[PDB]
Design a protein around this ligand. Structure first.
Ligand SMILES: Cc1ncc(C[n+]2c([C@@](C)(O)C(=O)O)sc(CCOP(=O)(O)OP(=O)(O)O)c2C)c(N)n1
Ligand code: SF4
Ligand code: SF4
Ligand code: SF4
Ligand code: SF4
Ligand SMILES: [Mg+2]
Lengths: 1164, 161
């Protein structure tokens, strides 16, 4: 049958049918494969064995790989899905699985490896890192090929006994939606070699016919034993070839080990692999028809590399070959595929000039214009070798010049771009539009979706294609017949109408009339509309949704507007298909919700009005650009073009060679995405600063100023007298940053005044006023104040060093990290695990960590997902070594003829170098005496002072903070965290416990509670939550504390300060509410208060220092809960969606009572 | 050296002696409540090993058995390898317990301490193996090891009472 799927679903479809067990672990962009396999098993989909697939989630891909190995050796057909860093961790087991000749298929959504930077996007770096393990390797070039070649892999591995890696390009194919022919399970079972399966069962570990495998071997037999598998690898090419003929007879689609396309007498041929083959064949069709003698060899079976099957499809007329590798091996002579082609042609004496290049790293665009550039390089007198395509390499001059732009799209193919807002329904509607068109017409349909790094308020760009011919355009849309803008704020911000065809359609969602078009639309946009004679349509979708009662949801409205003008299908047919999908989507919502969406369709058709623009729009002239402010060179050359969606134009000379970025760059973004912003009521404010404490974006802060410093304040900068003996004679004001606020509403909810001192007002109404207000508050001079930093009020007067990050509105993680920077950020180094905290904390080119007025601030680094604890441990060793080198130079200065005041500060530092306050005090004293002491010295004594000055950045004692999520701490990095805590080093571990893998969409974890439903746990998690805090207490010398900011501000303050001062390992497990819980983020602080009050989350502190004082180390800070446990679960969707459901809710309540009663015994 | 190495023991990668105490694997595994955990030593008690092995296999769930295995790297006369395991438990150096999750479902205490009162000297057992005499600061590490071995017995007595 025909369905609209992506590569992931296409792969999981075949993997599910052919497997009994699937051990999985989430990693983008492979996790959708494991998610859908869990849902199918949850609803009882049967594989070819008549049973449901058993899905088991491990603690890491290393654990997943071992489970695959054991399951295979014991007699169960087992598969798994992974990519990128996950595939690296499976490499050790891959040698074993291949070495033991076990049938197996790994499905890989090929993704780049973390080098100078992390990239979740697609290339072959991961697959190439395992090409020597002995696995076979099969490449799929399209979503249709994923369906077919996944079947080829599963059938071939049973026959050959050689395990397979079936890989397809991450995102470019794994997330591309296409209408394909789906192969029925019943047809798969008719092709399976059942004799091969039964032989596999007989080789299983079984005590009734036992055997020994995996022995240790001496040099006398190891080499021979390793070569004994030679026949199995020699027979694999023919086995795969015969399987491809089986699939060919069933589907009609013919695959070979290497496939050729292009002129039979071609002289220039490109050898490539993966989705690039689709782009190359489309270009080859275009060039061959124009008379060029070019061709393409698609590599399907990369390993084992069959020389016979490669030469079989190479035309005898080939004189020059360009090999394209989607990877980079630095310092290597050439990339993998290039060296293979060069080798095989040498082994057979072919006089063919071979040239290799690199493309598409990290989902870099690879379009037909680049393909011609590769072909033109083969047509040159001396073809450039070791080249790159798709970048401008102005440093080493490896890039090919893209001279001209060609349009190789098949005639009759419709192309549309949709600019949407984060979670406004645009992407979901386009997926439904593809499903509508694919199911009811003969046209092929394709969809690809570009997402934003910002988690809330980001830009989404949808790329859709429909045509009478199969769609091989695995690249972004170049010339669009229709461009739709579902957010009017994008007008004048992004190049929306880029590349639109003459006479194309421009659909806009805005409240602007035809006359307001002259003043609202920019001149460059008006020129394109007029010169290209576009059909410009406008619709006020927001007005329609308000009047009907759908709020601001415009997804149904904008989809109706598309079909009305696109002329892809009859307008009357589309309306039926839209309303039919509404019944499928809103049928269970009720009669009221159903008819509202029906009215949305009807009202949208009548409201879509074509804008009749004057022809004089073609001559419009840009308006004079204002005098731009002097911004740093990085902001001007890097951050602005990247946020302007022009980062691909930046040449190689723009970037550092090691991925090092400046700090404090998010303050230049000023996204202004808030719908409402807090307005401060000075008369109701008690000056408690709790609003600044809970802000997940540091958008609201308190400001103090002497009355003289309030001179040039705007009239709206109303201040109040400062409360407290510390701030006597000063003015106070709570000021919000309107362009950086997210409109989450946490600060208004936490305000404890009798009358609310914060009220949510629309941004547009007060944006002009509050911007000048914030610009004045930010320019206020520093005020020396003696407020105790150990209190909530006093700590918020210190500058936040984490601001304006990309976390969601109301995130429960950033308030914890923001508070740490306010206490110790002056002297801390952060080792941050991969996860949400690394995405909002370190997504290029914007850095949310900033500096104070002295230029000091946290240094931030992210290594890997699994190594963060050991990463920070290594930092502690190095910092200790750097202080030791400084202490030696200071002790040498004591014997030098230096000033008596210099010797006093040196001795004071040497005695207190391991104390935070004393080392800063005497450290700053030495800094003040350094310039004068150097001037008064000469010769070797001056050199000794210059060495101290070179190391003055290590006088102040540092504070190592190891930050990461619960998935890192409870699963993949738990072994390393256990080791670093047990070592006794002076490190501080902060676990942001969201009880799921939050960044990757919300998958199951050991931090997930009993009965909670998450991805990979569709039926709910049976086993209870692992108690990480209890295991760290078992050492006795590890400080462990469980905190929750929403529950108790004072309890969080005490545990953080006690943990940092403790000269040893400290573990802070913080409850972080998240969007994956299925709750209203406006009341994110309130949800954490209900969690502790209902006995769901405990609050305790284990202080090893109390044991040395003869006291009880365990202190239970909240003993008696006052709220109902069952009522808290019903306030989050992650528990209500389960409603077998009642049995799990009862087990969760029994575990919460036993956990509280166990803490009462440890406290008594 | 390993996390299972005790305080004061000298091994490779621990030339100056191991400072941090032995990691309590059994204590962390008991934290789940549904994992059968048992500590055995054949030289110390034949009957206690028989009971823990049979209970662990019949338990329909995860079972963890930590067995003390004397080794040549300890620096002992292997003729008395079984006796060295008896002297280890008699000196309070290695505990014998059984954590049965099935007892918790019957309303009983899951933790059973199989050896409550040690009768041998802890310091004399350390001097009977080369892996501790090669350290001979040594007295400072031995004092911490004896305080840690008493604190481990006191923690198991609280779980039993
Ligand atoms: C070895 C390994 N395995 C899996 C991953 C994928 N991966 C992540 C990224 C950022 O790399 C990604 O989304 O691509 S983030 C992530 C889970 C994060 O879970 P945590 O609970 O630790 O942090 P939070 O995101 O705050 O919930 C995983 C599994 C990875 N990066 N490395
Ligand atoms: S509404 Fe949210 S983002 Fe805006 S200032 Fe308040 S807490 Fe910060
Ligand atoms: S939470 Fe309310 S009372 Fe407290 S400082 Fe903020 S605005 Fe003022
Ligand atoms: S932890 Fe949750 S709320 Fe915070 S950024 Fe990640 S997904 Fe968003
Ligand atoms: S006694 Fe010998 S075989 Fe036994 S654990 Fe020690 S080294 Fe290994
Ligand atoms: Mg998490």
């Amino acid at each position: 049958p025909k369905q609209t799927l992506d590569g992931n679903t296409a792969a999981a479809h075949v993997a599910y049918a052919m497997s009994e067990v699937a051990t999985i672990y989430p990693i983008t962009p492979s996790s959708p494969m494991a998610e859908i396999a869990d849902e199918w098993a949850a609803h009882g989909r049967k594989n070819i064995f008549g049973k449901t697939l058993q899905v088991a989630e491990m603690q890491s891909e290393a654990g997943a790989a071992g489970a695959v190995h054991g399951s295979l050796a014991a007699g169960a057909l087992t598969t798994t899905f992974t990519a990128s860093q996950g595939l690296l961790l499976m490499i050790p087991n891959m040698y074993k699985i291949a070495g033991e000749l076990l049938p197996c298929v790994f499905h890989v959504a090929a993704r780049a490896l973390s080098t100078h930077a992390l990239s979740i996007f697609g290339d072959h770096a991961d697959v190439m890192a395992a090409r020597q393990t002995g696995f076979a390797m099969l490449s799929s070039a399209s979503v249709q090929e994923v369906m077919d070649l996944a079947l080829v892999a599963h059938l071939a591995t049973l026959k050959a006994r050689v395990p397979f890696v079936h890989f397809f390009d991450g995102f470019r194919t794994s997330h591309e939606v296409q209408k394909i022919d789906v192969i029925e399970y019943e047809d798969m079972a008719k092709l399976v070699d059942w004799d091969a399966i039964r032989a596999f069962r007989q080789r299983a570990l079984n005590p009734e016919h036992p055997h020994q495998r995996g022995t240790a071997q001496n040099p006398d037999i190891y080499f021979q034993s390793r070569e004994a598998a030679n026949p199995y690898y020699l027979a694999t090419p023919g086995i795969v070839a015969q399987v491809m003929e089986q699939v060919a007879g069933l589907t009609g689609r013919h695959y070979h080990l290497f496939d050729y396309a292009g002129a039979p007498d071609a002289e220039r041929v490109i050898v490539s692999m993966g989705s690039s083959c689709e782009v190359i064949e489309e270009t080859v069709n275009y060039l061959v028809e124009k008379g060029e003698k070019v061709g393409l060899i698609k590599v399907r079976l990369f390993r084992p590399f069959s020389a016979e099957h490669f030469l079989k499809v190479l035309p005898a007329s080939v004189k020059r070959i360009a090999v394209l590798d989607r990877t980079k091996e630095p310092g290597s002579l050439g990339e993998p595929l290039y060296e293979d082609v060069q080798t095989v042609l040498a082994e057979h004496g072919k006089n063919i000039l071979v040239v290799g290049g690199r493309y598409g790293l990290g989902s870099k665009e690879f379009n037909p214009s680049m393909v011609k550039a590769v072909f033109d390089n083969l047509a040159a007198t001396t073809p450039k070798n070791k080249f790159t395509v798709g970048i401008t390499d102005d440093v080493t001059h490896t890039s090919l010049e893209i001279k001209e732009h060609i349009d190789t799209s098949p005639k009759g193919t419709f192309r549309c771009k949709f600019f949407g807002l984060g979670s406004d329904g645009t992407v979901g509607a386009n997926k439904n539009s593809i499903k509508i068109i694919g199911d009811h017409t003969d046209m092929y349909a394709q969809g690809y979706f570009v997402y934003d790094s910002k988690k809330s308020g980001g830009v989404t760009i949808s790329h859709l294609r429909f045509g009478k011919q199969p769609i091989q355009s695995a690249y972004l849309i170049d010339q669009a017949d229709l461009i739709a803008c579902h957010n009017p704020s994008y007008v004048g911000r992004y190049n929306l109408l880029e590349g639109i065809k003459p006479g194309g359609i421009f659909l806009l969602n805005s409240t602007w009339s035809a006359e307001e078009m002259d003043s609202r639309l920019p001149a460059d946009m008006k020129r394109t509309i007029a010169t290209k004679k576009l059909k410009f349509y406008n619709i006020d979708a927001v007005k329609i949704a308000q009047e009907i009662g759908l709020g601001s949801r415009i997804n149904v409205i904008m989809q109706t507007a598309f079909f009305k003008i696109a002329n892809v299908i009859p307008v009357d047919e589309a309306i039926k298909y839209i309303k039919d999908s509404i019944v499928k989507t809103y049928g269970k919502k009720g009669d009221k919700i159903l008819n509202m969406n029906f009215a949305a369709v009807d009202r949208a058709l009548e409201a879509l009005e074509e804008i009749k623009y004057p022809a004089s729009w073609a001559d419009a002239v840009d308006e004079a650009a204002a005098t731009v402010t002097e911004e740093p060179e990085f902001i001007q050359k890097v951050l602005r073009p990247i946020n302007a969606l022009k980062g691909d134009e930046l040449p190689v000379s723009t970037f550092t060679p090691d991925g090092v970025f400046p700090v404090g760059t998010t303050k230049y973004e000023k996204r202004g995405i808030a719908v409402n912003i807090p307005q401060w009521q000075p008369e109701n404010c008690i000056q408690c600063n709790q609003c600044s404490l809970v802000c997940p974006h540091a958008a609201i802060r308190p400001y103090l100023a002497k009355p003289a410093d309030l001179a040039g304040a705007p009239e709206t900068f109303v201040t109040k007298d400062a409360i407290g003996k510390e701030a006597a004679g000063l003015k106070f004001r709570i000021q919000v940053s309107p362009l950086d606020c997210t409109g989450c509403g946490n600060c208004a909810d936490v305000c404890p005044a009798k009358v609310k001192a914060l009220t949510m007002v629309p941004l547009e109404e007060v944006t002009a006023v509050e911007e000048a207000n914030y610009n004045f508050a930010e320019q206020l001079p520093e005020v020396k104040v003696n407020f105790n930093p150990a209190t909530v009020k006093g700590s918020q007067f210190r500058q936040p060093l984490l601001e304006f990050s990309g976390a969601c509105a109301g995130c429960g993680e950033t308030p914890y990290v923001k508070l740490v920077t306010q206490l110790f950020g002056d002297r801390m180094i952060i080792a941050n695990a991969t996860g949400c905290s690394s995405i909002w904390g370190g997504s290029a080119p914007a850095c949310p960590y900033t500096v104070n007025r002295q230029g000091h601030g946290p240094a931030w680094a992210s290594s890997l997902f699994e190594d963060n604890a050991e990463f920070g441990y290594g930092m502690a060793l190095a910092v200790a070594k750097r202080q030791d080198e400084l202490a030696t130079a200071i002790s040498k200065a004591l014997e030098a003829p230096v000033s008596a005041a210099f010797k006093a500060a040196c001795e004071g530092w040497l005695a207190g170098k391991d104390d935070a306050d004393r080392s800063r005090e005497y450290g700053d004293r030495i800094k003040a005496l350094l310039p004068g002491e150097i001037s008064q010295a000469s010769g070797e004594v001056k050199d000794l002072l210059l060495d101290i000055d070179r190391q003055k950045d290590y006088l102040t004692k540092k504070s190592i903070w190891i930050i990461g999520g619960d998935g890192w701490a409870y699963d993949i990095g738990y072994g390393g965290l256990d080791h670093v805590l047990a070592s006794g080093a002076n490190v501080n571990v902060l676990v942001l416990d969201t009880e799921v893998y939050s960044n990757t969409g919300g998958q199951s974890s050991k931090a997930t509670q009993t009965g909670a439903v998450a991805r990979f746990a569709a039926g709910g998690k049976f086993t209870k939550k692992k108690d990480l805090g209890l295991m760290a207490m078992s050492y006795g010398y590890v400080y462990v504390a469980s905190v929750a900011m929403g529950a108790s501000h004072s309890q969080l303050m005490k545990a953080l300060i006690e943990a940092e001062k403790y000269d040893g390992p400290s573990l802070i497990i913080a409850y972080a509410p998240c969007i994956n819980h299925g709750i209203n983020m406006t009341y994110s602080q309130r949800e954490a208060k209900k969690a502790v009050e209902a006995g769901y989350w405990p609050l305790y502190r284990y202080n090893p220092q109390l044991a040395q004082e003869g006291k009880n180390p365990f202190i239970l800070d909240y003993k008696t809960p006052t709220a109902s446990f069952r009522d808290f679960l019903m306030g989050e969707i992650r528990y209500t969606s389960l409603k077998k459901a009642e049995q799990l809710f009862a087990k969760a309540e029994a575990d919460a009572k036993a956990r509280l009663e166990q803490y009462k015994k440890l406290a008594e």
